[PDB]
Design a protein around this ligand. Structure first.
Ligand SMILES: Cc1cccc(C(=O)C2=C(O)C(=O)N(c3ccc(CC(=O)O)cc3)[C@H]2c2cc(Cl)c3c(c2)OCO3)c1
Ligand SMILES: Cc1cccc(C(=O)C2=C(O)C(=O)N(c3ccc(CC(=O)O)cc3)[C@H]2c2cc(Cl)c3c(c2)OCO3)c1
Lengths: 123, 123
């Protein structure tokens, strides 16, 4: 059986750069996947998209649009201290949070900072 | 000017018992009120409701219906370890989280537990 850590490693293996918004999307997919006992179907979808010739980035986005736990889903809230806790390669992807953000519309997660500031990570 | 702690103490002084769902609603009102620089209007609405003869419980609900930061607002996510971090008097008000919980519909907050469990506090 595949673990959340295994799936993270598999997905990271295909991504360029490091600490990018796509790496964070992997984290979200793995966390929500684990919490919904869906790591296997998610892995199968990822591999199937790659096998069709999709970019790994598109494979991750297709998971958000095809696997039902992400469809019309609000992004998870992640509590952190400051913007400094977020990798450099994610910084320019941070945005003010819109009213109903949705994972399948590119809103990966919402970071809540210790002083109450709130930023959404957008792809 | 009134602080979030001052307001919390004022509201607690009107509520019977301790650690109830209404005490948690005070916490949410004061935190969100502080983050939106809205403690003054919140206090004014609370006092006005009491002055019309409303119960302090209803005055708190009135705040969620009358102060625009709570109108059609999703409940805040609060990260905790387990149900053991929630006071005894709130336990029976914890519910599975519905698709679109709203503060002004009685969904005070969403507790996210460390193992991935999620519970909404409902009034
Ligand atoms: C930039 C940053 C700061 C702080 C946290 C994170 C982050 O995404 C996560 C972790 O540091 C982490 O350990 N997460 C995680 C991912 C999958 C599992 C499933 C498992 O292996 O048991 C567990 C933890 C990340 C994480 C991802 C999400 Cl969606 C979270 C979260 C943490 O808390 C609330 O929602 C990212
Ligand atoms: C049952 C339980 C467990 C853990 C936290 C709480 C809770 O509601 C909060 C606190 O322990 C706390 O210190 N909060 C709080 C309330 C107002 C302010 C404004 C200020 O005086 O600076 C600051 C902190 C409570 C709290 C309320 C909300 Cl809505 C929160 C939250 C914490 O984290 C994210 O969203 C309640």
């Amino acid at each position: 059986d595949i673990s959340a850590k295994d799936l993270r490693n598999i997905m990271y293996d295909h991504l360029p750069g490091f600490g990018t918004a796509f790496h964070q999307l992997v984290q979200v997919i793995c966390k929500l996947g684990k919490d919904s006992n869906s790591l296997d179907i998610i892995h199968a979808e990822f591999q199937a998209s790659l096998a069709e010739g999709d970019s790994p980035q598109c494979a991750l986005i297709q998971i958000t649009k095809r696997v039902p736990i992400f469809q019309d889903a609000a992004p998870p809230v992640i509590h952190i201290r400051s913007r400094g806790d977020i990798p450099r390669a994610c910084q320019k992807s941070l945005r003010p949070v819109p009213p109903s953000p949705k994972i399948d519309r590119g809103w990966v997660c919402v970071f809540q900072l210790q002083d109450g500031k709130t930023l959404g990570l957008k792809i």
